[PDB]
Structure formats: C-alpha cells, structure tokens
C-alpha cells in the first residue's frame, strides 16, 4: 500500500489516487506576504471542555488520538466555518530531523512537526459522509518547534511505547486537547484536502500562526514509533509528511493583520 518510502511515497500516490493532482490539494506553502486579511471571518471558537478521548492507535502512518464524536462534546465553530464541526481525532506529522516534519510551510519554512485536529461537519451525520463533501471537514493545524517541553503533550508521549507498531492501540481516556493549543488563535485558512490517501478535497484548513514548543526528548519519542507491524522488519516512523502542493486557483486568508 501507500506510505512515505521511496517506492511508495507522495510522488507515487497519484497512480492510485488521481485526485493527488487536483485543484485543491494540501498541504500548501503559506506565503505570508500574499495572504490577505479577511474582515468577513467570524471569531474562531474552540469548545473542547466536554471532550472525551477514548483511545490511541498506531495506524501505520501516524498515531491517532480518537474521541467520542457521537455528540457535540468537542467542537470547532466560527472563523471561516458555517455550522458545527466535531472533533474525531488528532494526529501529528513529523520529521527525522528538527528542520523538517511539517506539511504546511510558512514562507517555505518547515517546522519539526505539525498537529492536525480533525473535525467533521455535523450536517453530514458521520465522518464517512462528511469526507464526500466540499465542506465536510475542518482541520486545525498547529506547528511544532523544538524548544521547551509542552506539558500537555507528555501524557501522549508516555503512552507511545505501548503502541510501537502498526495496529496497536491503547486506552487513552481523559486527555484534554486544550493542552496542545498555543496562546493565540490567529490563523490562516484556505480550501484543501486530506493530506493522506484518499486525498479527498473536503477540508477547510485553519492553520494557526503561533507554533507550540515541544522538547527534544518529546520529539525523539515520536521518532521511536514504527511504521511496521510487530514481528516485521523495523522501520522507524519518521518523515510521515506530504510536501507542499500547488496552490492553483486559491487564495489564503488571514484572520489577523
Ligand atoms: Co494530518
């Protein structure tokens, strides 16, 4: 199947997923000088007080922290969004080195990692129906730089030894995703896609301007995960990022001046 190797990486995905060469693919480079302030944007509302985390899963490409999305417990609203978007999972993309790992770039700068909080539009009833719609998903993207530790990340890092290999999961209840957010909610937004196959063009991206800081030790633990299953040759889960795709006929909007 697809992955991040030389033989199955991003440059190959179009053969099975022709939408890889589509009109609204993600990620993109955010050219900060050409993004324009949009006065029509509403304020961003992140309402995560009632979030119910359930489980963490190594799916062979990243690890997902999964949430109960059968009620409006953890929702994103406002900004560019019309309606209510429920948190289903978050995951990260990261590098083998601190100078790469993010999917979005900012003036061509790569961060060490990128957090994606994935939400689906409740008007479509379930995730699987939402991904078939142009406004089905809202993904909040947050850059990670290496510096000080992120305290709210540590409970994630410490369970990673229990989900080393593909297909492993662990209970992961009572995790508060608020502890992964930066101080400011200023953002850029644009219409795009999933960044993994099937690369569906269903995402309103909301990328925060302010990165969070994580420690060397925290990112090093991400890099100890495995793409392989237990009892298969070890292949470290690193460099699980798609590079920037052509912007084509899109404008990136800023929530701030
Ligand atoms: Co992602």
UniProtKB/Swiss-Prot annotation:
Cite the cofactor comment: Zinc. Can also use cobalt(II) with lower efficiency, but not copper(II), nickel(II) and manganese(II).
* A Pfam family this chain is assigned to: Carb_anhydrase
The UniProt-reported impact of residue 118 to K/R is:
Strongly reduced CO(2) hydrase and p-nitrophenyl acetate esterase activities
SUPFAM superfamilies from the UniProt entry: Carbonic anhydrase
Q: What is the effect of changing residue 61 to A?
A: Reduced CO(2) hydrase activity, rescued by 4-methylimidazole (4-MI). Reduced proton transfer. Enhanced proton transfer. Enhanced proton transfer capacity
User: What are the record keywords, sorted?
Assistant: Acetylation, Cell membrane, Cytoplasm, Disease variant, Lyase, Membrane, Metal-binding, Osteopetrosis, Phosphoprotein, Zinc
Share what the entry says about its subunit structure, partners included.
Interacts with SLC4A4. Interaction with SLC4A7 regulates SLC4A7 transporter activity. Interacts with SLC26A6 isoform 4 (via C-terminus cytoplasmic domain).
Q: How is this protein named in the record?
A: Carbonic anhydrase 2
Family named by the database record: Belongs to the alpha-carbonic anhydrase family.
Q: Where is this site: Involved in the binding of some activators, including histamine and L-histidine?
A: 89
Residues the entry annotates as binding substrate: 195-196
Give the EC class as a word. Answer: lyase
What effect on the protein does mutating residue 141 to R have, as reported in its record?
In OPTB3; complete loss of activity
* Variant or mutagenesis effect after changing residue 64 to L: Reduced activity
Q: In terms of domain of life, where is this protein from?
A: Eukaryota
